[PDB]
Each structure stands twice: as structure tokens, then as C-alpha cells.
Write a protein that binds this ligand. Structure first.
Ligand SMILES: *[C@@H]1O[C@H](CO)[C@@H](O)[C@H](O)[C@H]1NC(C)=O
Ligand SMILES: *[C@@H]1O[C@H](CO)[C@@H](O)[C@H](O)[C@H]1NC(C)=O
Ligand SMILES: *[C@@H]1O[C@H](CO)[C@@H](O)[C@H](O)[C@H]1NC(C)=O
Lengths: 127, 604, 99, 127
């Protein structure tokens, strides 16, 4: 019954701002770290932004630093992100993955198994 | 509407002493010439209470500002008022004092009293703007500035004022007791003329009952309502307020206490004694009289309650060959699974969880956090390199190619499925095709069934006879495990642990919490499962090597063998006893002496 | 048509609305079954000269037995006494002499 | 105070899975043999499956063979039905009933007295 759902995708203008959320049902998300990934038309799925189980460790790709802010609420069991100053390079399908790190360290710089995946949502930036 | 005032600046608390007050009629009965003992919520004698000026001038300039903190309400409140000019006017009760939780107001104007409970939006400084009239001045007009709005009103009450009019040293004392039990907001009241006493006067005064109210709300915090004679727009240099708040109000906090009340032939409480104050009072309570004769009496008992806990329990050297499975080199193919048996070992499941290395953590039948606590009979381990999108199909009550054809998972599964990847270890550039997977089978399997037969399945009507061809395929296809494959196509090292909970002897158990050793102090101890309270002392007894415990002639444990350290420890139950009070007649002296029977004078 | 609906709240909550019903006329000096404001008992009611406090409704003996009760109509506290229980003894000589 | 309570009913997709639990309060369920029974809209109370007091003997309906799973926990005083490969023919109200073998022979495939009954839980299968 583990289910992951996106909320907040849609069409915006370059330079604008929007907020995306991954909610879940069937289990608790405080134990898991949650990452955000994106698949562009004709491009592979890249790592957009990761946050730890407790939220104290975060990862941003170099292309997404300073425009994206990742966060989570463990009490209501959801994970948020805020993007500002959007670009046409950010239009794509978008996914939230909840899993546990695979190596001996606190950060989330590296990639690993991606336990649970939602159906994703579309984010479009064009004007 | 409410008007903002200046900051309270957190004035320091100040204390004074309450001398035998707060005594209210605990019930609604008539008693004549009798001594009655009641256990209920009251003000302790010689208790130390917090006192606030109505107006304080604490600034160097001479700023006149109120002392109106919102104070906690625990199990009732005693509120005393030494006042002269009718400046305290009401009270607010509730938990949040906002538009979120229901709140109660009591207010007293010149005519009657107004009591409500609604959903008030309360400001930071509620108050009553009180002004006299230009001709009469006999009474005063009050403009309420206590709440912004009120909704969902659930009670209303109007009756004779609680506070009498006070319109140059006839200060008077209004003593009030407010309690909340079982949806009951009870107010007991009394007033008395005071003369030349700044603090509470010394003496006694029965406090009669005034009202009970069925409000039925939760109240934890309260505030004091006070009256502005001056103007907030134009605060005067001095004397605009009332003698810089010489009128004062005292707050005392009630506790469950026992009292011996003496009803006279009038049914007026003329004297009372609290049982917990001093041994003389304890003797008076236990003897049920206000006078005790010369002699010795027994009041209560002490037990020296233990101060901490200790547990010790032996840890075996060998733990498990978990590292032989989880950290193995070569793994089994999905068509020929590798069950491994684990028994006669202590299983460390905290290691696997604290590893923070496995992606999926799903234990069914057992909560993840409690594997180390409870233990089982036998353990079976499997761990494989399945594809990523075929990970969710290892949990009972599921459908899928592996979930339907390869290995069934019974619904009544007590165990764990714990998974991660095997990319850098089980993938190769040319692809690792040593893992063979089945897609065709004649029929579905049973839980925990293993088939390794390599017979060629007949997709059509003609028989294959062990030979491939048209409508004939080999059972096993190899995966292209490459380090460049996507998340779902990656190799995934998944583990399934099946545990056995039976009415059978347990051979696998979890790690055991062992603590440090404390001696010559009363402690709760748990040795090898024996729990008790005692003081552990070094013992000279010699145990034979196969013995563990020791009992006295009366079937009570007295000696024990520490598992880690082979010393032998004896147990003495923690010293207790009775308490006795030596006292002469109360008509001669009020000092007493205490004697503790059958104990040593160190634990006191 | 003028219509009034009266909704009664019957919960585990204090009762502020009650029916005085019939104020049964006082019948004293004969032990009756009495029910004063919820107290149910048996005994004889007599005029008593004690004074209850205005809030007090009960009078207690040294033990738990209640003795005096306040009349809600007109105060004049009445006191209660259980009405003369006892025991019967038979004084007889030997039955071989007389019955 | 003899109470048999059904729980776990709901709406599921055909081909999915569901779990139903029958719990006993006020009496010991280990001594009784328990059967799950059903009534569909416009149909009769047909015997879905049964398990003996010890759990060593079970019976299934040919309509639920190979897809259903009956079991019991006698220490926890409860009986479970797991439900796999669901079909739209599986929407109905499901009761759990406890009885004693009222005939010779160990198996419980015959129908008999059902001395104790539950209130029933709805299981709907539709997509
Ligand atoms: C009252 O205050 C003094 C010191 O300010 C303190 O010794 C005493 O404990 C206080 N009263 C109570 C009941 O604690
Ligand atoms: C007993 O009652 C009267 C009122 O009737 C009261 O004024 C009096 O002082 C009381 N007696 C004593 C000794 O207090
Ligand atoms: C215990 O009592 C004895 C007297 O019988 C005394 O000598 C000893 O010092 C006491 N020990 C403690 C710890 O109070």
C-alpha cells in the first residue's frame, strides 16, 4: 500500500517560482531520505536534489544550486521543494524517490538504490 | 476593543509567606463539635506565595505599568486581594486564551457580575477602562477592553457582585479559592476587614462557598483583570493611577493535602491542622485530636525507595555468520536459491539497521525496532541480485513474474525483506549473465517451494521432448547486468529473513543490554532474568561452579553470581521501618523528636 | 401557527433543568420513605431546632449516618430518626408446667 | 459477551490483494473451528472456506481454490483470510463464523451449525 504522489506541477514562465510536494500514503517517511529527480525530453534522469531522513544533510546538483530549496515535514509526512527563477532548461517530467543511503557517511551526494518512486508530474517553463 | 500597552519586561518574581489561610468548607454538610479529616485540594500552611503590585513604578523615570502576567492554573488557585479602591475587576481562564480554544470570563462592574464561556479573541493586555462621572462619582463606568470578539457562547450567568464596592486605610482582604473538577468550576469566597497588615494577616478565617458552575472546559492558564483609572493615551507623570498600585494581590497554588478541621458547636471551622507540615502535626492527625499527651506514638512508615536501575546478563563470544551472508563473495542464482540456517547464535539486528546501507526495510509480522528484544527458534536467510523493478514483488500478497512463478511468499510471513543494490560488485562492462531467471512454468508454486528443473516448456501443442524449437523455450534467460543500466535494470542485492516463532526452545536471541555495576546503594537489579530491589554487597560465600543462586531457610533469594565478573554478591532488602514521634503534652511545648525503628542512621 | 421546539440535552453532564413535579405536602411524626433532592431513606421526620448554614443541605452524625435535612420549601431543619426496630423475647416457664 | 469481529474489508482492484481478520473477544477461539462465508447481492450464504480448531484441516470453495489462503493464530485468538488474484465476482459481504465439528470425521468440508456469527465486512472488487 506504499504510494507516492506528486502535487504542484504545471506550466510557468522563465524566471518564475513554484512549489512542488511529494506526499505519500501507506508508510512513514521520517526514516527515509528523499531525493528529487528529473527526466528531460531526450535526456536521462538526473539527480535534482536530495535530503536526508532527518533533513540535516542536503544535496543540490551544480546546475540547480541557488534556485532550488529542498525541505521536508516529518510530522505531516511530506517533502517539499521551492524553485525560483526558472529556466527553459528545467521543463521535464519530475519524480520523488524515497530510500535509504547505501554507504558509510551522513551526506547524500552520491546516488544509490531508489526504493520507492511515484508516478511523477510535468513541470514546464516556456515563454 | 483592545488597546496595546507597553512590555511587561519580565519583572522578577517576589515571594512572601501565607500563615494559615485558604481554609474553605470542603463539603456542604453540617458538623457540630467534632473533628473531621479531609483529603482534597488546598493551600499549604506556611506556604510560600507570589505577590504582585496592581501598578508598579519600576522605571527610573517613574513609568506606571501593570503587573498582569498570565499565570499557570494547576489543580485550583488561591487568590488573595488586599485592596482599597476597586481596581481588580475579573479573571480569564482557559488553555490558549485565543480563538482556538474555549475560554471563560468573570467580570465585576458596579451593578452585577457577568460570567461567560465562549471563543474569545484575547489581546495581550486585557483591561477595563474605568472612569467616574462628572457629577455623581458614586459609581463608575467600565468600558471593556478584554477581548476582540466572541463566538460559540456556551454559558451565561449574572448575579450579585463577587467584589463589594470600596469607595484612608480601610484596605480589605478578599480571599477566593477557585477549583476545577469534573467539569465543575467552583468558587469559594470570603471577605474580611484588615488593618495595618501589608501581607496576609496571621490567624484563621473560614472561607464560605459562593457558587458552582457547569462550564466543563479544560483550563490550564489564567490572567488577572485590572482597571485603568488613568488614560493610556496620556500617561500622567504621577498620581494618575492609584497610589502607584499599593493595592496588591497574592497568588498561592493548591495541592492535594490532608487537613484535620475542627467543627465547633456552631458548625464554623475555628481551627485546622495540616498533616504533612511537621511531625507534631503528623502526630496530631494520626491521633485525631488537637492535644496529645506525654508519651510515644507511631505515625507513618519509611521505605527508602531505590534511586536507579542495573541489569547484567552474559554475552556469548560467537555472534552469527551474518557477515558470511551479507558480506559474502558469490551468491546463488534465482532458480536455485540458497537457504541458510541460523541457530545457537546471538543475532545482531541493530547492525543491519544502523548500517544505513540497505534501501528497503520492510519487516512483516515483527516491528523493525524490536528484533533485538524478542528472539526466535530458527532463522533462514536468502539474498539475491534481482532486478530493481522486481524488488517490490518480494512481500507476501503480491503478483508478478518472480512473485508468481519463481518463489511464493505466504501471507502469514513473519520476517523481513531488506534490499539495496549490487552495481559496483555484481555488474560488469560485458554484462553479467550468470544469473538465470524463469519466465515460463507449467503452474504456480507453493510457499517455500524450490524447483531447479531445466525442462523445456511446451508453449504449443506438440511436445518439446527436451529439445527447443517452435513453441519450445529454455526455462532460464540471463540478465544483462551492466554498470550503465538504469535504476530498474540495475542489480539489486535483496535479503529475505524468515524467522520461526514456535512453542519450542529458542536458539537464536538478540543482543542484551548490560549496564555498569553499583554497590552499597539501593537499586533495582535484573540478574539473568531475576528482577528485584536490594543493595548488593560483597559476599564471602563460596558457590560450587555449577550453582548460580542462593536461598535462605525461608525461600528468599540472598546470594547471586555475577555472570560477567565471577565474584559472588549478596543482597540485602532496602532498609525500611516505622517512624515514631516522642512529644510531651501540647499544653507544655510544641517541639518534638523523631525516632526511626530498626534502621541505620545513614539512609535518613 | 406558533411552534416551539424544546430539545433536551441528556448526557453525563450536570442537570440544571428539573421538574419540581408535585410538592408533596409534609407528613411528619410517622416514619416514611423519604426522597429529599435525591437522598433516599426510611425514617421518622421531626421538627428540629438546629441551624444549618444556608449552603448546607445535610447533617451528619459522628458516624456516616445522616440525621438532619433542610426543607427546600421552608427551612426549619427537620431531623431523621430510624423508627424503633428491636427484638421480641418470650418469657415462659417449663412447658411441662404451663403453656 | 461473546463477540466475533471482522476487519479489513474495503475496495480493491481485480488482480490485487486484500486481508481479512476475524477476532474473538469474551471466549477462546482456539477451541472452535472457524469458516469465512459470504453473501453477494442477490445470492445465498455460500461456504467460502473453513479451518479446524487446531488448523490441521482446511476446506476451500472451488470458486476460491488456488487464490485464497485461510489460517489462524490460536495464541492471538484470531483467524485470517488472505485474498489474491481478485475477480469482480469477489464483491460481497463477508462474515466469519465459529462452530464445533457436529459430525464424525476430522474434515470440515460439510456445512453445519454455525453457533456464533460476526457482523460482517464489505469486500468490493471492481475496476
Ligand atoms: C520561600 O522562599 C524561600 C527563599 O526565598 C525558600 O527557602 C522556601 O523554600 C520558599 N517556600 C517554599 C514553600 O518552597
Ligand atoms: C455560636 O453561634 C452564635 C450565633 O448563633 C455565634 O455568634 C457564636 O459566637 C457561636 N459561639 C462560639 C463560641 O463561637
Ligand atoms: C550501621 O549501624 C552500626 C551500629 O550498629 C554502625 O556502627 C555503622 O557505622 C552503621 N553504618 C551505616 C552505614 O550507617
Amino acid at each position: 500500500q506504499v504510494q507516492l504522489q506528486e502535487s504542484g506541477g504545471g506550466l510557468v514562465q522563465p524566471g518564475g517560482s513554484l512549489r512542488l510536494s511529494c506526499a505519500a500514503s501507506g508508510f512513514t517517511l521520517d526514516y527515509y531520505a528523499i531525493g528529487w529527480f528529473r527526466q528531460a525530453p531526450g535526456k536521462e534522469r538526473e539527480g535534482v536534489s536530495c535530503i536526508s531522513s532527518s533533513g540535516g544533510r542536503t544535496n543540490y546538483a551544480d546546475s540547480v544550486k541557488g534556485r532550488f530549496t529542498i525541505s521536508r515535514d516529518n510530522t505531516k509526512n511530506t517533502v517539499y521543494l521551492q524553485m525560483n527563477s526558472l529556466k527553459p532548461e528545467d521543463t521535464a517530467v519530475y519524480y520523488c524517490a524515497a530510500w535509504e543511503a547505501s554507504r558509510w557517511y551522513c551526506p547524500l551526494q552520491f546516488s544509490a538504490d531508489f526504493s520507492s518512486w511515484g508516478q511523477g508530474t510535468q513541470v514546464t517553463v516556456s515563454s | 476593543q483592545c488597546v496595546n500597552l507597553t512590555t511587561r519586561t519580565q519583572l522578577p518574581p517576589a515571594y512572601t509567606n501565607s500563615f494559615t489561610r485558604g481554609v474553605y468548607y470542603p463539603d456542604k454538610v453540617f458538623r457540630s463539635s467534632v473533628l473531621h479529616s479531609t483529603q482534597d485540594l488546598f493551600l499549604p500552611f506556611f506556604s510560600n506565595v507570589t505577590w504582585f503590585h496592581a501598578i508598579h513604578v519600576s522605571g527610573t523615570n517613574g513609568t506606571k505599568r501593570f503587573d498582569n502576567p498570565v499565570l499557570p492554573f494547576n489543580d485550583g488557585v488561591y487568590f488573595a486581594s488586599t485592596e482599597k479602591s476597586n481596581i481588580i475587576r475579573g479573571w480569564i481562564f482557559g488553555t490558549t486564551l485565543d480563538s482556538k480554544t474555549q475560554s471563560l470570563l468573570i467580570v465585576n462592574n458596579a451593578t452585577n457580575v457577568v460570567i461567560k464561556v465562549c471563543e474569545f479573541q484575547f489581546c495581550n493586555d486585557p483591561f477595563l477602562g474605568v472612569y467616574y462621572h462628572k457629577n455623581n462619582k458614586s459609581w463608575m463606568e467600565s468600558e471593556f477592553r478584554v477581548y476582540s470578539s466572541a463566538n460559540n457562547c456556551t454559558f451565561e450567568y449574572v448575579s450579585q457582585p463577587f467584589l463589594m464596592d470600596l469607595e484612608g486605610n480601610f484596605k480589605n482582604l478578599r480571599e477566593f479559592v477557585f477549583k476545577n473538577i469534573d467539569g465543575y468550576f467552583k468558587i469559594y469566597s470570603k471577605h474580611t476587614p484588615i488593618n495595618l497588615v501589608r501581607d496576609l494577616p496571621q490567624g484563621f478565617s473560614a472561607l464560605e462557598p459562593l457558587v458552582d458552575l457547569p462550564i466543563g472546559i479544560n483550563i490550564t492558564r489564567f490572567q488577572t483583570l485590572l482597571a485603568l483609572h488613568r488614560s493610556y493615551l496620556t500617561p500622567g507623570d504621577s498620581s494618575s493611577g492609584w497610589t502607584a498600585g499599593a493595592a496588591a494581590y497574592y497568588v498561592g497554588y493548591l495541592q492535594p493535602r490532608t487537613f484535620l478541621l475542627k467543627y465547633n458547636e456552631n458548625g464554623t471551622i475555628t481551627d485546622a491542622v495540616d498533616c504533612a507540615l511537621d511531625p507534631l502535626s503528623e502526630t496530631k492527625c494520626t491521633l485525631k485530636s488537637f492535644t496529645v499527651e506525654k508519651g510515644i506514638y507511631q505515625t507513618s512508615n519509611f521505605r527508602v525507595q531505590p534511586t536507579e536501575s542495573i541489569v547484567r546478563f552474559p554475552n556469548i563470544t560467537n555472534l552469527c555468520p551474518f557477515g558470511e551472508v551479507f558480506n559474502a563473495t558469490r551468491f546463488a542464482s534465482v532458480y536455485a536459491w540458497n537457504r541458510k540456517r541460523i541457530s545457537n547464535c546471538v543475532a545482531d539486528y541493530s547492525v543491519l539497521y544502523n548500517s544505513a546501507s540497505f534501501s528497503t526495510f520492510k519487516c512483516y509480522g515483527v516491528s523493525p525496532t524490536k528484533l533485538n528484544d524478542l528472539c526466535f527458534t530458527n532463522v533462514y536467510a536468502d539474498s539475491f541480485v534481482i532486478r530493481g523493478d522486481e524488488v517490490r514483488q518480494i512481500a507476501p500478497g503480491q503478483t508478478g513474474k518472480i512473485a508468481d512463478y519463481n518463489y511464493k511468499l505466504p501471507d502469514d510471513f513473519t520476517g523481513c525483506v531488506i534490499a539495496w543494490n549490487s552495481n559496483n560488485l555484481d555488474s560488469k562492462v560485458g554484462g553479467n549473465y550468470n544469473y538465470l531467471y524463469r519466465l515460463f512454468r507449467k503452474s504456480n508454486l507453493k510457499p517455500f517451494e524450490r524447483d531447479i528443473s531445466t525442462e523445456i516448456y511446451q508453449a504449443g501443442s506438440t511436445p518439446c521432448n527436451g529439445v527447443e524449437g517452435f513453441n519450445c523455450y529454455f526455462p532460464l534467460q540471463s540478465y544483462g547486468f551492466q554498470p550503465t543500466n538504469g535504476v530498474g535494470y540495475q542489480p539489486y542485492r535483496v535479503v529475505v529473513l524468515s524467522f520461526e516463532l514456535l512453542h519450542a526452545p529458542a536458539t537464536v536471541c538478540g543482543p542484551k543490554k548490560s549496564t555498569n555495576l553499583v554497590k552499597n546503594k539501593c537499586v533495582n537489579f535484573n540478574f539473568n532474568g531475576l528482577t528485584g530491589t536490594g543493595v548488593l554487597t560483597e559476599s564471602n560465600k563460596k558457590f560450587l561452579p555449577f550453582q548460580q543462586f542462593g536461598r535462605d531457610i525461608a525461600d528468599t533469594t540472598d546470594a547471586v553470581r555475577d555472570p560477567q565478573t565471577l565474584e559472588i554478591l549478596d543482597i540485602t532488602p532496602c532498609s525500611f521501618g516505622g517512624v515514631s514521634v516522642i512529644t510531651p503534652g501540647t499544653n507544655t511545648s510544641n517541639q518534638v523528636a523523631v525516632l526511626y525503628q530498626g534502621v541505620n542512621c545513614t539512609e535518613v
